[PDB]
Amino acid sequence: GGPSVFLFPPKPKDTLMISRTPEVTCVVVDVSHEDPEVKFNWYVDGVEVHNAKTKPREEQYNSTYRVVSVLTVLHQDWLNGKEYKCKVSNKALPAPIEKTISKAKGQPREPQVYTLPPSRDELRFYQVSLTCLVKGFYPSDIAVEWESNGQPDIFPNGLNYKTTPPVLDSDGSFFLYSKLTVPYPSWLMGTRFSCSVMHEALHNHYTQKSLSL
Amino acid sequence: GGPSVFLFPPKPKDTLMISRTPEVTCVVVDVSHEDPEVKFNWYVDGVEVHNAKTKPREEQYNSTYRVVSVLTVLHQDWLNGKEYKCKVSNKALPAPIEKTISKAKGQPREPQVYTLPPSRDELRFYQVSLTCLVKGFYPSDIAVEWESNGQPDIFPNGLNYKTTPPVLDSDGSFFLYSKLTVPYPSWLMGTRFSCSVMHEALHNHYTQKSLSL
Ligand SMILES: *[C@@H]1O[C@H](CO)[C@@H](O[C@@H]2O[C@H](CO)[C@@H](O[C@@H]3O[C@H](CO[C@H]4O[C@H](CO)[C@@H](O)[C@H](O)[C@@H]4O[C@@H]4O[C@H](CO)[C@@H](O)[C@H](O)[C@H]4NC(C)=O)[C@@H](O)[C@H](O[C@H]4O[C@H](CO)[C@@H](O)[C@H](O)[C@@H]4O)[C@@H]3O)[C@H](O)[C@H]2NC(C)=O)[C@H](O)[C@H]1NC(C)=O
Ligand SMILES: *[C@@H]1O[C@H](CO)[C@@H](O[C@@H]2O[C@H](CO)[C@@H](O[C@@H]3O[C@H](CO[C@H]4O[C@H](CO)[C@@H](O)[C@H](O)[C@@H]4O)[C@@H](O)[C@H](O[C@H]4O[C@H](CO)[C@@H](O)[C@H](O)[C@@H]4O)[C@@H]3O)[C@H](O)[C@H]2NC(C)=O)[C@H](O)[C@H]1NC(C)=O
């Protein structure tokens, strides 16, 4: 064939925070040197739009260019299920490649957030684990972060945490876990930690759950 | 080209338990009706073997057969890093397709297992969540299960649990979480639950961590 197209959704956090701005990204790979001509046509539910923006092309070590087309979207357009289509055309293609992406369908469901202290057996070590359980949400688009009331003297570098991907639960909903690693002295001195979750189905798209000794 | 080949590693649990038998699986898709002839040649570190077994072909909705070749492997052969090669040949191919798979390289690291009781705020609900943290292991091949001392009268159907995929941690090791959902009355009556973890770097490839009220 010829070039390949891939269309990605906006960041879950971008569509949920008022401060941020979501965008859809249409990437084009496998584009030839002989015909590096690429065009884009964007359609929101079958209605063309021309506010998208194409970034400069870039060569890769595999001797192929890379074209990307970014389309900023309204917060509530995506959350209401509007479908976004990217139409790519180039000489190397017999017919243009059209791709579409939208939010997962299904009545959203609200997550429950639970913080669990570190296991008693983990204090033998110096780094202990604070856990945040987020369960029962749909769709799986979600954002998770940790906060502290600890000054930089205890945390000169920021907080160290990692979050699992969403896992389909036995009731059609999703769950995940996020682990925050902190020194034991910080846990013992009464530091207040906070698990923050952004999800469509939450009121104000946000909830925050605390954890401390 | 023609048909496509895919080679899969043995289940982590299969290579760790003596009772089970691990297998490398070499799948062939996109095989034509005009030429449904397939051959396999297996090599363990460049040494041919003839104990593999081919299962009957199966028709697909897209009108393509699918041929599978299964090779049982010795437990310690895989765990010691031996590379397994699958060579596929068919009329529709100009030259045979060879694929190889082996265990991830790197000094193995032993996991730590910690059980966390359900959050106090989750008792509002009837289904509560028991958590098992497994962290600090390498490679990411691991198997996790839950056990109970509860008869079938409390659990006529088995235990309900889901386990996350491994997540790369900030020290090059991996962690995961497994969630067991149980009715609150079972938690309150003293039922003893058990998180069982099978990993190469564990002594006897097995460890078990308990949890109860
Ligand atoms: C006619 O219909 C067929 C069936 O629908 C089509 O077959 C499919 O063909 C595609 C390629 O076009 C293959 O894609 C690959 O999938 C691999 C994963 O396969 C496992 O998981 C899927 C479900 O997720 C499952 O259906 C497979 O059968 C396979 O299951 C595994 O099976 C083994 C033993 O059989 C078992 O031990 C495992 O536990 C089990 N695992 C699971 C999760 O069930 C990928 O690994 C491949 O990835 C490659 O390519 C990626 C990018 O393309 C790259 O990132 C990767 O690194 C890697 O290189 C690849 O995506 C499907 O597997 C195959 N499905 C089946 C059932 O055969 C057929 O293509 C279609 N005809 C045509 C013309 O399209
Ligand atoms: C020249 O070199 C560049 C970089 O090495 C290659 O760019 C990649 O090309 C492959 C072509 O297959 C693309 O593969 C697709 O990747 C997607 C992942 O997107 C994430 O990752 C990229 C980079 O890591 C991020 O930029 C992006 O924001 C995302 O975070 C997958 O989603 C795709 O999977 C889907 O399609 C395949 C094929 O149908 C299915 O098998 C999957 O199941 C799934 O449906 C796919 O794997 C890759 O995206 C390209 N990266 C970038 C950054 O563009 C060029 O391909 C290479 N040139 C040639 C000719 O290959």
Residue nearest to atom 11 of ligand 2 (CA): A29
Return the closest-CA partner of residue B40 out of B100, B74, B90, B94: B90
> A163 phi and psi, to 5 degrees?
-125, 135
Closest atom of ligand 1 relative to the B9 alpha carbon: 37
Does A63 sit in the ligand 2 pocket, CB within 6 Å?
no
Measured CA to CA, the distance from residue A184 to residue A129 in angstroms comes to 9
Instruction: Tell me which ligand sits closest to the C-alpha of residue B57.
Output: 1
Size of chain A in residues: 213
CA distances from A177 to A25, A160, A163, B47, B133 (A): 28, 14, 6, 44, 10
Inter-chain touch B118–A114, beta carbons under 8 Å: yes
Q: What is the dihedral of CA A73, A77, A81, A84, to 10 degrees?
A: -30
Place of tokens 């059609």: A172
**Cβ contacts of B43 within 8 Å, gap of 6 or more:** B49, B84, B85, B87
Count residue pairs from A and B with Cβ separation < 8 A: 71
Q: What is the CA radius of gyration of chain A?
A: 22
Ligand 1 residue neighbourhood (C-beta within 6 Å): B 4, 6, 8, 25, 27, 29-30, 60, 62, 64, 66
**Residue nearest atom 46 in ligand 2 by C-alpha distance:** A6
Burial environment of residue A18 by CB neighbours within 10 A (0 to 12, 13 to 18, 19 or more): exposed
Considering the domain A103-213 in this protein, what is its CATH number?
2.60.40.10
How do beta strands A167-168 and A160-163 pair? unpaired
Q: Is the peptide bond before B139 cis (omega within 30 degrees of 0)?
A: yes
Q: Which of B125, B164, B170 sits opposite A177 (nearest CB)?
A: B164
Nearest-CA residue for atom 48 of ligand 1: B6
> Could you tell me if B51 and B41 are in contact, meaning their C-beta atoms sit under 8 angstroms apart?
no
- What ligand is nearest to the CA atom of residue A65? 2
At position B158, the amino acid (one-letter code) is G
A60 lines ligand 2 (CB under 6 A): yes
Distance (Å, whole) CA B10 – CA B104: 12
Tokens at A150, concatenated: 């600890």
- Which residue is closest in CA terms to ligand 2's atom 9? A29
For chain B, count helices (H), then strands (E). 3, 16
Task: Report B:43-62 residues touching A (Cβ under 8 A).
Answer: none
Helices (H), ranges, A11-108? 12-16, 75-79
Side-chain half-sphere CA neighbours of A188 within 13 A: 8
Torsion on CA atoms B26, B29, B34, B36, rounded to nearest 10: 20
Contact B210/B197 with Cβ under 8 angstroms? Answer: no
- Long-range contact list for B30-33, CB < 8 A, 24+ apart? B30/B2, B30/B3, B30/B4, B30/B64, B31/B3, B31/B57, B31/B64, B31/B65, B31/B66, B31/B67, B31/B90, B31/B92, B32/B2, B32/B3, B32/B64, B32/B92, B33/B63, B33/B65
Going by alpha carbons, the residue nearest to atom 12 of ligand 2 is: A4
Instruction: Please tell me the total number of residues recorded for chain B in this structure.
Output: 213
Work out the end-to-end distance of chain B between its first and last CA atoms, rounded to an integer number of angstroms.
Answer: 61
Distances (CA, A) of A131 to A181, B61, B154, B173: 9, 45, 28, 18
Rg (CA), chain B: 22
- Asked if omega into A139 is within 30° of 0 (cis), the reply is yes
Chain A nearest-CA distance from B190, in A, is 19
Partner residues linked to A97 by β-bridges = A88
User: CATH 2.60.40.10: which residues of chain A?
Assistant: 3-102, 103-213
- Burial of B51 per CB tally in 10 Å (0-12, 13-18, 19+): exposed
Instruction: With beta carbons under 8 A apart, name residues in chain A contacting B179.
Output: 133, 135, 175, 177
Give the gap in angstroms from C-alpha B74 to the nearest C-alpha of chain A. Answer: 32
| Bridge partners, A84 (sequence order) | A44, A101
Kindly state which CATH superfamily the domain B3-102 is placed in.
Immunoglobulins (2.60.40.10)
A149 vs B: CB within 8 A: no
- Resolution, rounded to a tenth of an Å? 2.4
Residue pair B24/B84 in contact (Cβ under 8 Å)? The answer is yes
CA-CA distance, B130 to B82, in Å (whole number)?
A: 38
- Tell me the nearest-neighbour CA distance from A213 into chain B, angstroms: 14
CA distance B131 to B64: 44
Torsion angle of alpha carbons B182, B186, B190, B192, nearest 10°?
Answer: -40
How near does any CA of chain B get to the CA of A39, in Å?
A: 29
According to DSSP, residue B12 is labeled: H
Q: Is A98 helix (H, G, I), strand (E, B) or coil?
A: strand
